Amino acid sequence: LVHSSN
Amino acid sequence: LVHSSN
Amino acid sequence: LVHSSN
Amino acid sequence: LVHSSN
Amino acid sequence: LVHSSN
Amino acid sequence: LVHSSN
Amino acid sequence: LVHSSN
Amino acid sequence: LVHSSN
Amino acid sequence: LVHSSN
Amino acid sequence: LVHSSN
């Protein structure tokens, strides 16, 4: 899992 | 689970 | 944003 | 499941 | 931001 | 699964 | 579990 | 951005 | 940013 | 697990 708003 | 309003 | 694999 | 209003 | 694998 | 609004 | 409003 | 192989 | 292999 | 808002 990876999350980033960039 | 991930939540973000960004 | 919401993510869930459930 | 994914939700986003973007 | 909230993350949980539960 | 991949999601991005970019 | 992680929570942050940043 | 979200990625998961689940 | 969040990463987890769980 | 890694989290960073940077």
CA-nearest residue to A1 within chain H is: H4
- Which residues from D are below 8 Å from C5, CB to CB? 1
Nearest to B6 by CA among I5, F2, H1: H1
Asked whether the beta carbons of residue I1 and residue A1 sit closer than 8 angstroms, the reply is: no
Nearest 5°: CA angle at B5, between A5 and C2? 85
**HSE on the CB side for C5, CA within 13 Å?**
13
Number of other residues whose CB lies within 10 A of the CB of residue I2: 20
Asked whether the beta carbons of residue D2 and residue F5 sit closer than 8 angstroms, the reply is: no
Q: How far apart are CA A6 and CA A3, in angstroms?
A: 9
Spatial neighbors of C2 by CB under 8 A, at least 6 apart, are B1, B2, B3, D1, D2, D3, D4
Q: How was this structure determined?
A: X-ray
